[PDB]
Amino acid sequence: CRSEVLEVSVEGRQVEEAMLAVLHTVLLHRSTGKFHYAAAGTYSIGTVGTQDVDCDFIDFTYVRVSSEELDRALRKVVGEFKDALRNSGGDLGQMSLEFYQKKKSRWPFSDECIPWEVWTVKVHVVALATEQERQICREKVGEKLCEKIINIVEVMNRHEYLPKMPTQSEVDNVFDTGLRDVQPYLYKISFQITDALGTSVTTT
Amino acid sequence: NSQDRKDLDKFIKFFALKTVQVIVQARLGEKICTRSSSSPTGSDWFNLAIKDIPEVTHEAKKALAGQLPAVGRSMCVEISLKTSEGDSMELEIWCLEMNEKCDKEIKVSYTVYNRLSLLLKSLLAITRVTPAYRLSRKQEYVILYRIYFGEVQLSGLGEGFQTVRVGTVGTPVGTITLSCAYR
Numbered sequence A: 001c002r003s004e005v006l007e008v009s010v011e012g013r014q015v016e017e018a019m020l021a022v023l024h025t026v027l028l029h030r031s032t033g034k035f036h037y038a039a040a041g042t043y044s045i046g047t048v049g050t051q052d053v054d055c056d057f058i059d060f061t062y063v064r065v066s067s068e069e070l071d072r073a074l075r076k077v078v079g080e081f082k083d084a085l086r087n088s089g090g091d092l093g094q095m096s097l098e099f100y101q102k103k104k105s106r107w108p109f110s111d112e113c114i115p116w117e118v119w120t121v122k123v124h125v126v127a128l129a130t131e132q133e134r135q136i137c138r139e140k141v142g143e144k145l146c147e148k149i150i151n152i153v154e155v156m157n158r159h160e161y162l163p164k165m166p167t168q169s170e171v172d173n174v175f176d177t178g179l180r181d182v183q184p185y186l187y188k189i190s191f192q193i194t195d196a197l198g199t200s201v202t203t204t
Numbered sequence B: 001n002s003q004d005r006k007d008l009d010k011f012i013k014f015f016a017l018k019t020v021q022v023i024v025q026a027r028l029g030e031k032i033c034t035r036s037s038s039s040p041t042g043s044d045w046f047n048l049a050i051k052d053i054p055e056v057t058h059e060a061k062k063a064l065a066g067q068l069p070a071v072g073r074s075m076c077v078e079i080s081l082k083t084s085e086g087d088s089m090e091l092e093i094w095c096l097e098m099n100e101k102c103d104k105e106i107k108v109s110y111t112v113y114n115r116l117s118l119l120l121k122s123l124l125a126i127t128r129v130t131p132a133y134r135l136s137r138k139q140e141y142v143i144l145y146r147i148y149f150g151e152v153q154l155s156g157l158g159e160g161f162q163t164v165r166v167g168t169v170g171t172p173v174g175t176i177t178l179s180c181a182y183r
Helices: A015-029 A068-087 A131-156 B002-026 B054-064 B110-126 B131-137
Strands: A002-011 A035-037 A043-045 A050-054 A061-065 A093-103 A112-126 A187-192 B074-083 B088-098 B141-150 B162-171 B174-182
Touching (some): A002 A015, A002 A131, A015 A061, A015 A068, A015 A093, A015 A131, A061 A068, A061 B131, A068 A187, A131 B110, B002 B054, B002 B074, B002 B110, B002 B174, B054 B141, B074 B131
Antiparallel strands (some): A093 A187, B088 B174, B162 B174
C-alpha cells in the first residue's frame, strides 16, 4: 500500500479551502462515471463533470468533480478537522484520505478493508497580526498549493497499481456507489491532531 | 489488430482535440463548469464532459491537417500575451508528443482509453496551477492561442523557463507525453 505525505503552512481561515483543494484533486483522479450494469454482465460508464472552485481566503483555483453530494461530504469532515484544530492548540494536525478494497472472509470474520493507497496532508496553522500578513499569505499559499497539485498529478501519473474492474456483484467492494454523480473508489477520510516532534542529529 | 488501431487512432485524435479544448478553455478568462450524466450521450469522450468550442475545433483540425502525433512530430498549443504596447510574449507552449517506445502489453481498447481519460483529468488540474492561468482570468492584457505541429521550439519562452509534466500514457504505437513549458 503506497503512501504520499504533503505539508501545508496555512492561516487558520484558509485551512478548509486548502484541504478541499487537496482532497478534490485526489478524488478527481480517483473516481469515474457511475456504472450501469446489464444482466449480461456488461456495463456502461457515465460522464463525469468538473468545475472550477475559486478560493476566497487563498489566491488559488482548483478543479473538482461536479458532484454536489461529494463536496458536502468533504466540507463536513474538513469542518470536523477545522473545529478540532481550534478546540486544541499549539503542540497542528493532519488529515488522511485512504483508498481500499473490500475482501470477503469466511464466517465469523467480517470483510477485510485493504488499503491500496493513502494520502496524508499535515497542516501547520500560523497566526497573523497585520493586514499585510493576510494578503501576502493569500498569495503565498496559493503558490504553495500549485506545487502540491503539481506533485499530486505527478504521483498520480505513476500508474503504480489500481484494483481490477469489478463485476456487477463485486462493485461495492471497489467503488463507493452511494453517490449520484460520480463513483469514487472506496475511500476513508480520517484526521488526527498530532504532537510536535523535535530533531536529533545533523548530519552536517 | 487492424480494428484496435483504428480505435486507437480515434482515441488519440479525440484526445488531442480534447486537450486543445481543455487548454484553451482554461486560458479563457472565465470559470469552466460541466455537469455529470448518469444517462450520457454518445459524444462524451473519455467519460468527461468537455464542451467543444467550434472555432477551436476548427484550427485544431487545420493544424493537425487530418494527422496524428508521432515520431518527431508533436502537437503544440501556444498561449501568448499581446499587451497595450503590442509586443508578443510566449507564455506557455503545451506539448503533446508521441514517444518512440511502445507498450505492446497495454491492452487496447479501454486500458489506453481509460488512462487517456485520467490524463485529461490531470490536464484540467495542471492547467489551473500555472501562472498563465491566474493571469488569463485577472482581466490591460489579452491572451492569444495558436496550435501547430512538428518539432517544438521553446525559444520564445526566454532563458530559464520552467516545465511541468502533466503525465504520460503508453500505447502499442508509442507512449503519449503531455507537458507544458512556461515563462
